[PDB]
Swiss-Prot record:
Protein name: Translation initiation factor 2 subunit alpha
PROSITE patterns membership: S1
Gene Ontology terms, MF aspect: ribosome binding; RNA binding; translation initiation factor activity
Keywords: Initiation factor, Protein biosynthesis, RNA-binding
Taxonomic lineage: Archaea, Methanobacteriati, Methanobacteriota, Thermococci, Thermococcales
All residue ranges annotated as the S1 motif domain in the record: 8-79
Pfam families from the UniProt entry: EIF_2_alpha, S1
Subunit (UniProt): Heterotrimer composed of an alpha, a beta and a gamma chain.
NCBIfam families: PRK03987.1-1, PRK03987.1-4, PRK03987.1-6
């Protein structure tokens, strides 16, 4: 967005130069702008050798204690940064970090310039959404189309490709419950056996997951998790017969619940 960090941001910076009184670091997320960190901010106790903390090229997440744009001076802090504070950022960095390697990986297949892209997407996105990666992610879930109109039509095709390959495959899920009853001194025994048989059986078709949660005789609810409703609805009907049949053979009556005709 604007040129310099915000009063208070937790930022990431490479240890450019360091000496007696402090360290000059370059903000890895603000092309070129360089900031300063006093020695009185390296630790919560006066330091003996700043060396024991900083080292040339070292990356770090600090807190913009005070800043003046008109001059280009950015004063940084290491003290005020609790473990949470830190990883909180180290995260979003690592995050947008990938969101980058993906956009860059987009200029290579679309055969364009880094800047001539980073200005037509990385910006439209990190503006419409708040985060590029998230947009890429949500594109991977809800479908590439979530980007149409928002970025050039000539992009999408390459993106879908990239996204799908490096990002991850989102999945659907559905609940359903049965009324399974088996009159016999070991009905449970089989019921369980029954579901467990059926379960482990379906669970094998990688990209599927079935889970039987008991919830009070004679109900048991199944939680199918395929990669898309098509699948899911079909995996339930599979576990339909599978159950009904098997408990019937053992003299029971298992039924699903949804018919309503």
């Amino acid at each position: 967005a604007r040129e310099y960090p915000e009063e208070g941001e937790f930022v990431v910076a490479t240890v450019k130069r360091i000496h007696n009184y402090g360290a000059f670091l370059e903000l890895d997320e603000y092309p070129g702008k360089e900031a300063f960190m006093h020695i009185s901010e390296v630790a919560s106790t006066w330091v003996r050798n700043i060396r024991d903390y900083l080292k040339e090229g070292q990356k770090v997440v600090a807190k913009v204690i005070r800043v003046d744009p008109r001059k280009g001076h950015i004063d940084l802090s290491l003290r005020r940064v609790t473990q949470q504070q830190r990883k909180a950022k180290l995260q979003e960095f690592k995050r947008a970090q990938k969101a980058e390697n993906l956009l860059k990986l987009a200029a290579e297949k679309l055969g364009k310039d880094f800047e001539t892209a980073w200005r037509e997407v990385w910006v439209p996105l990190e503006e419409e959404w708040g985060e590029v990666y998230a947009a890429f992610e949500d594109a991977a879930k809800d479908g590439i189309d979530v980007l149409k109109g928002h970025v050039p039509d000539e992009w999408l095709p390459v993106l879908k490709e990239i996204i799908d390959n490096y990002v991850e495959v989102p999945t659907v899920t559905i609940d359903a419950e049965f009324e399974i009853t088996v009159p016999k001194p070991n009905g449970v025994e089989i019921i369980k056996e029954a579901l467990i048989r059926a379960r482990d059986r379906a669970n094998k078709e990688k990209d599927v997951e079935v889970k039987f949660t008991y919830l009070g005789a004679p109900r048991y609810r199944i939680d199918i998790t395929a990669p898309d409703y098509y699948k899911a609805e079909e995996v339930l009907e599979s576990i339909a017969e599978e159950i009904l049949r098997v408990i019937k053979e053992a003299g029971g009556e298992a039924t699903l619940l949804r018919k309503e005709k």
